[PDB]
């Protein structure tokens, strides 16, 4: 019973149950999908709306961290926004102190270090979100995923959430050497429309963002015309 | 102190005299005011040796940590910006005219003057130290941008020599270092082989006629150099 109450405690098997349980929060969350191309990177996230009466752009799961970088949050949105706020603090330390756009690999490791910090101490709990860091700084187009554990990994393509398994099957059909950001916006959105439960989550939209040569290596929401 | 850094195409030449002086006595005759921050980013240190050494060591250590953790080369802009923050934070406590100069593959050769205020100006060439004031007119007249690496080194040495010929507070060896895509080339010109000094300039061989023998004429002849004549 006491093995799993806090993240400061390893089990006998050698794992940290509270971080596994935080991970469960992401796997029960709305599906997010992303693609790293030559042109740039694309993030698409399904937002499950509880109510018919929300504004467009309510509970935005995708946030600019810097000019060149954005975090899409798959998991508990509020937790995710604490990471976005930190990712921002790191992005602005890179510009304030070192006069450089933070590199994607650096920003990701910084997000992972932060999320990990919250897995080590009894007083805090692990974050309930996987951050998807998309960047197009001087290290080129980079897509990373920090998970609740703080484990960072670079991806060509990546699915998170309750349709993680099926959305990944569809990302494996894409050729990543070939595809452009303009194709990806189409295919990533198409994937999210395909994998979505129509009977369970009636009200939803597909928030897409990118950071590509097209957008001036600036991390922005894609216009509503490209999205379908 | 005379420090300067000029840009050529590939990179930069930092140049400096070698004299630290406690006012009117030369404490060190062979100082190295060209201070490594990274492989290919040096600073030239003018003002309090204590203050610039302390900053150069602090900034070198931050740049080394930074370079380790980003797992890539450091941009000169980064070194300049760190050095500016420190030179600005402490602008009342320190006396520190810095020139950060170096190579990075993004921006090539870059020069930054960080003078006493903690301004950071990106320049084609920068002058610093007590001896800088002699060179502004020398550069205005003789400096032509788009020099070869070799011409810049020869010019930078000729510059530092012109400054340290007139500045009492400057002197000794001329240290240069070229920072570019290639391995850094330091070189040290000893004073006895300096490209210019007033002592060897034929302009200043004939002495001022100050002494002048007691004569029956207002005709200035020369200095009296013998008691018999």
Contact B70 A103 (CB under 8 A): yes
Q: In whole angstroms, what is the distance from residue B225 CA to residue A190 CA?
A: 102
Task: Please give the structure tokens belonging to residue B174.
Answer: 């001329």
Q: Write the DSSP symbol of residue B123.
A: E
Task: Please give the structure tokens belonging to residue B63.
Answer: 């740049």
Query: What angle in degrees, to the nearest 10, is found between the helix axes of A77-98 and A104-117?
Result: 130
Q: Which of residues 67-106 of A touch B (CB under 8 A)?
A: 97-100, 103, 105-106
List the end-to-end C-alpha distance of chain B, in Å, as a whole number: 44
- Is B1 part of the annotated catalytic residue set? yes
| Closest residue, chain A, to B79 (C-alpha) | A98
Q: Which chain B residues contact residue A97 at CB under 8 A?
A: 81-82, 85
Residue B150 three-state SS: helix
The residues with which A137 forms a beta bridge, in sequence order, are A140
Task: Please give the structure tokens belonging to residue A2.
Answer: 């006491």
Residue A185 three-state SS: helix
CA atoms B50, B173, B202, B228: torsion sign? positive
Count: domains in chain A = 1
Q: In whole angstroms, what is the distance from residue A103 CA to residue A92 CA?
A: 12
Q: In whole angstroms, what is the distance from residue A206 CA to residue A60 CA?
A: 10
Phi, psi (degrees; rounded to nearest 5) at B113: -85, 125
**Upper half-sphere CA count for residue B118 (Cβ side, 13 Å):** 15
CA dist A123 → A21, A23, A126 (Å): 17, 19, 10
Task: Please give the structure tokens belonging to residue A60.
Answer: 């935005």
Q: Which chain B residues contact residue A105 at CB under 8 A?
A: 70-71
Query: Which site among B62, B68, B72, B104 would you substitute to test the A interface, given the most A Cβ atoms closer than 10 Å to its Cβ?
Result: B72
Task: Please give the structure tokens belonging to residue B142.
Answer: 């003789």
Q: Write the DSSP symbol of residue B30.
A: S
Q: In whole angstroms, what is the distance from residue A149 CA to residue A17 CA?
A: 10
* SS3 of B89-118: HCCCCCCEEEEEEEEECCCEEEEEEECCCC
CA atoms A201, A202, A205, A206: torsion sign? positive
Q: Are A8 and A120 in contact (CB under 8 A)?
A: yes
Phi, psi (degrees; rounded to nearest 5) at A88: -65, -50
Q: Are A141 and A133 in contact (CB under 8 A)?
A: no
| Closest residue, chain A, to B62 (C-alpha) | A98
- Give me the residue from A100, A106, A109 closest to B75, CB to CB: A100
B149 Cβ contact partners less than 8 Å away, ≥ 6 residues apart: B8, B9, B10, B11, B13, B178, B180
State the DSSP string of B171-222.
Answer: -S-EEEEEESSSPPEEEEE-GGG-S--TTT-GGGTSPP--S----SSS----
Give me Rg for the CA atoms of chain A: 17
Element (H, E) at B12: strand B12-16
Query: Which site among A90, A96, A100 would you substitute to test the B interface, given the most B Cβ atoms closer than 10 Å to its Cβ?
Result: A100
Contact B70 A99 (CB under 8 A): no
Q: Name the one residue in this structure whose structure tokens are 């400054």.
A: B163
| Closest residue, chain A, to B106 (C-alpha) | A138
Phi, psi (degrees; rounded to nearest 5) at A101: -55, 130
Q: Name the one residue in this structure whose structure tokens are 């032509």.
A: B144
Burial-class residue B144 by CB neighbours within 10 Å (0-12, 13-18, 19+): exposed
Q: In whole angstroms, what is the distance from residue A55 CA to residue B42 CA?
A: 55
Q: Could you tell me where the beta strands, DSSP code E, fall in chain A?
A: 32-36, 40-48, 62-64, 69-75, 129-137, 140-146, 152-155, 157-160, 204-212, 220-221
Q: What is the CATH number of the domain that holds A173?
A: 3.60.20.10
Q: Entry resolution in angstroms?
A: 2.8
Q: Are A176 and A35 in contact (CB under 8 A)?
A: yes
Contact A106 B70 (CB under 8 A): yes
CA atoms A115, A117, A120, A122: torsion sign? negative
Residue A92 three-state SS: helix
The catalytic residue among B1, B20, B78, B176 is: B1
CATH code at B1-229:
3.60.20.10
The residues with which A75 forms a beta bridge, in sequence order, are A129
**Owning domain of residue A89:** 1-228
Q: In whole angstroms, what is the distance from residue A75 CA to residue A161 CA?
A: 7
- Give me the residue from A98, A138, A139 closest to B66, CB to CB: A98
Q: In whole angstroms, what is the distance from residue B93 CA to residue A131 CA?
A: 44
* Residue B40 zone, left/alpha/beta (φ > 0; ψ -120 to 50; rest): alpha
| Closest residue, chain B, to A101 (C-alpha) | B78
Q: Which of residues 135-154 of A touch B (CB under 8 A)?
A: 138-139
Q: Which of residues 176-215 of A touch B (CB under 8 A)?
A: none
Contact A99 B69 (CB under 8 A): no
Contact A139 B72 (CB under 8 A): yes
Cβ pairs bridging A and B (under 8 Å): 25
Phi, psi (degrees; rounded to nearest 5) at A20: -70, -35
Q: In whole angstroms, what is the distance from residue A71 CA to residue A207 CA?
A: 13
| Closest residue, chain A, to B85 (C-alpha) | A97
Q: Write the DSSP symbol of residue A4.
A: G
Residue A215 three-state SS: coil
Q: Which chain B residues contact residue A98 at CB under 8 A?
A: 66, 78, 81-82
Length of chain B equals 229
Q: Are B21 and B169 in contact (CB under 8 A)?
A: yes
The residues with which A131 forms a beta bridge, in sequence order, are A73, A146
Q: Are A42 and A158 in contact (CB under 8 A)?
A: no
The residues with which B175 forms a beta bridge, in sequence order, are B16, B188
């Amino acid at each position: 019973s006491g093995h799993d109450q806090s993240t400061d405690v390893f089990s006998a098997e050698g794992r940290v149950f509270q971080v596994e349980y935080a991970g469960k929060a992401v796997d029960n969350s709305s599906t997010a999908v992303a693609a790293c191309c030559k042109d740039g990177v694309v993030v698409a996230v399904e937002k499950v709306h509880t109510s018919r009466m929300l504004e467009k752009g309510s509970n935005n799961r995708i946030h600019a961290v810097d000019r060149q970088a954005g975090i899409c949050i798959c998991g508990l949105l509020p937790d995710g926004r604490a990471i976005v706020s930190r990712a921002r603090q790191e992005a602005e330390n890179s510009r304030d102190i070192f006069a450089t756009p933070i590199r994607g690999s650096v920003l990701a490791n910084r997000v992972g270090e932060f999320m990990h910090a919250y897995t080590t101490h009894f007083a805090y709990r692990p974050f309930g979100c996987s951050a998807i860091i998309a960047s197009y700084a001087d290290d080129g187009p980079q897509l990373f995923v920090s998970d609740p554990s703080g484990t960072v990994a670079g991806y060509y393509g990546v699915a998170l959430g309750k349709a993680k398994t099926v959305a990944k099957s569809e990302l494996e059909k894409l050729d990543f050497s070939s595809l452009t950001c303009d194709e990806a916006v189409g295919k990533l959105a198409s994937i999210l429309h395909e994998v979505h439960d129509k009977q369970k989550d009636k009200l939803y939209e597909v928030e897409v963002a990118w950071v590509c040569d097209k957008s001036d290596r600036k991390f922005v929401h894609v216009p509503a015309d490209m999205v379908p | 102190t005379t420090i300067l850094a000029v840009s050529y195409n590939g990179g930069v030449v930092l140049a400096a005299d070698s004299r630290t002086s406690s006012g009117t006595y030369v404490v060190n005759r062979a100082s190295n005011k060209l201070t490594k921050l990274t492989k290919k980013i040096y600073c030239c240190r003018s003002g309090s040796a204590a203050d610039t050494q302390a900053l150069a060591e602090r900034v070198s250590n931050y740049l080394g940590s930074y370079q380790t953790d980003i797992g890539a080369g450091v941009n000169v802009a980064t070194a300049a910006n760190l050095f500016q923050k420190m030179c600005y934070m402490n602008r009342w406590n320190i006396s520190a005219g810095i020139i950060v100069a170096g190579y990075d593959p993004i921006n090539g050769g870059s020069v930054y003057s960080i003078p006493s205020g903690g301004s950071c100006v990106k320049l084609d060439y920068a002058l610093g130290g007590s001896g800088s004031i002699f060179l502004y007119s020398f550069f205005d007249a003789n400096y032509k941008p788009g020099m070869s690496k070799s011409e810049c080194v020869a010019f930078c040495q000729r510059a530092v020599a012109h400054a340290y010929s007139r500045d009492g507070s400057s002197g000794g060896l001329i240290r240069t270092i070229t920072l570019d895509a290639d391995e850094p080339e330091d070189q040290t010109i000893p004073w006895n082989r300096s490209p210019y000094c007033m002592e060897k300039d034929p302009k200043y061989v004939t002495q001022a006629t100050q002494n002048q023998p007691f004569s029956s004429s207002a005709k200035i002849t020369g200095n009296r150099m013998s008691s018999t004549g």
